[PDB]
Amino acid sequence: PMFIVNTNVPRASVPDGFLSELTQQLAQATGKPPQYIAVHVVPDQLMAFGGSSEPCALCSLHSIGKIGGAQNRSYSKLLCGLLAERLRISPDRVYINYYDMNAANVGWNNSTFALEH
Amino acid sequence: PMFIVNTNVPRASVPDGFLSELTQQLAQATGKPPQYIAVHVVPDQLMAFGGSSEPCALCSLHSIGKIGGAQNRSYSKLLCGLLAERLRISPDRVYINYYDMNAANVGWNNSTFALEHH
Amino acid sequence: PMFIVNTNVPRASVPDGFLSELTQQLAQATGKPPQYIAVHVVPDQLMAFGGSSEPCALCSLHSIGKIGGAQNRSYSKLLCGLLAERLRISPDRVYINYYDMNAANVGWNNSTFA
Numbered sequence: 338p339m340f341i342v343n344t345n346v347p348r349a350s351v352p353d354g355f356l357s358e359l360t361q362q363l364a365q366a367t368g369k370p371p372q373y374i375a376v377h378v379v380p381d382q383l384m385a386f387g388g389s390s391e392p393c394a395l396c397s398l399h400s401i402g403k404i405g406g407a408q409n410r411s412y413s414k415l416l417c418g419l420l421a422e423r424l425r426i427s428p429d430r431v432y433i434n435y436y437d438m439n440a441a442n443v444g445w446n447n448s449t450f451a452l453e454h
Numbered sequence: 455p456m457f458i459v460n461t462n463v464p465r466a467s468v469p470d471g472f473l474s475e476l477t478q479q480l481a482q483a484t485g486k487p488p489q490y491i492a493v494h495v496v497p498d499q500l501m502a503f504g505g506s507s508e509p510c511a512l513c514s515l516h517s518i519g520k521i522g523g524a525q526n527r528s529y530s531k532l533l534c535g536l537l538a539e540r541l542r543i544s545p546d547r548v549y550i551n552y553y554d555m556n557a558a559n560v561g562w563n564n565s566t567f568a569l570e571h572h
Numbered sequence: 573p574m575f576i577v578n579t580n581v582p583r584a585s586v587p588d589g590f591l592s593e594l595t596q597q598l599a600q601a602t603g604k605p606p607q608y609i610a611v612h613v614v615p616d617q618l619m620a621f622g623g624s625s626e627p628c629a630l631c632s633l634h635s636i637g638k639i640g641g642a643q644n645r646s647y648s649k650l651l652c653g654l655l656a657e658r659l660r661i662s663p664d665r666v667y668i669n670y671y672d673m674n675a676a677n678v679g680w681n682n683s684t685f686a
């Protein structure tokens with residue numbers, strides 16, 4: 338699993354511990370070992386939501402499996418909660434694109450996760 | 455709808471009201487209220503297009519529906535037009551990836567846009 | 573084809589020639605003319621991989637076709653090879669998302685490739 342957050346919130350406002358909290362919470366949420374989890378935070382972005390330059394975020398979560406209706410609503414509650422508490426971004430100014438990646442379409446360590454054929 | 459532009463054009467070359475213009479134009483183009491539209495511009499990027507570092511852009515438009523052959527051609531004419539006029543990027547050095555997102559796969563406001571089933 | 577690499581490796585550590593080597597190797601690997609190839613490198617990123625902030629990379633390759641099981645394994649060997657040699661990133665700290673794009677969903681020059 339990998340989570341990316343792009344935000345107009347200033348770098349200075351990103352608290353110590355943020356990447357590690359994302360990593361651990363996502364491991365728990367996805368039921369996957371933390372060794373697998375990648376996180377990427379991009380502050381100071383030139384972006385608008387609803388035409389307003391108030392704090393907002395555009396995010397993505399890629400996962401091989403564990404993507405779907407109820408699971409995604411749970412990820413959204415978790416991730417919006419963290420963005421609100423840690424970056425002071427209103428949940429209704431966040432978009433998260435979820436991608437259910439096929440194992441054959443994810444590269445890692447000189448190969449992919451399709452090892453069967 | 456959300457539109458992202460990554461470009462090697464300098465931050466100083468990005469017009470002041472550029473984000474607002476994109477928001478309004480995309481609202482009109484998508485038929486959606488501006489309150490839904492998100493825009494994101496990333497200048498000063500290290501990029502090459504065709505092996506050259508002349509001004510270029512790599513973009514994406516995500517939308518739940520309203521994505522398809524004819525519509526995408528219309529989006530491309532609109533968005534390339536804006537990038538050329540405002541950022542002075544030639545249309546043949548722009549790529550735009552279009553994504554038709556399922557409502558269940560777009561998160562917003564503590565949930566997603568799949569509110570119908572459990 | 574277009575390739576994006578986001579990494580926490582410092583800008584100064586990106587060698588002269590890197591974008592051009594990526595362009596050339598991707599042209600060769602995808603079979604597409606180098607005039608098509610777009611490459612984008614984003615250094616100095618705030619990232620963690622497995623909870624650690626040692627060098628890592630999150631990448632994507634979008635292509636109209638030329639995406640598939642064996643082809644993607646070959647792209648991964650090629651691209652991880654380059655990231656290891658040029659940016660000193662361990663291949664096991666790299667993820668690459670592959671996208672097989674429909675030509676109608678790729679805009680260019682005021683239109684699409686459909």
Ligand SMILES: *[C@@H](c1ccccn1)c1ccc2cccnc2c1O
Pocket residue numbers: 338339373399400401402438443450667669
């Ligand atoms: C998460 C992930 C999904 C897509 C792109 C990057 N990361 C992830 C990472 C590693 C494995 C290994 C085996 C099975 N599943 C995953 C996975 O979902």
Ligand SMILES: *[C@@H](c1ccccn1)c1ccc2cccnc2c1O
Pocket residue numbers: 432434455456490516517518519555560567
């Ligand atoms: C645009 C959009 C699509 C995908 C990801 C982010 N933004 C968008 C936003 C909100 C709604 C709500 C209801 C129906 N459609 C959309 C929509 O296309």
Ligand SMILES: *[C@@H](c1ccccn1)c1ccc2cccnc2c1O
Pocket residue numbers: 549551573574604608634635636637673678685
């Ligand atoms: C590579 C590509 C794929 C998706 C998005 C951006 N670039 C690429 C570029 C142009 C053409 C034209 C005709 C056929 N195929 C491609 C292509 O794979």
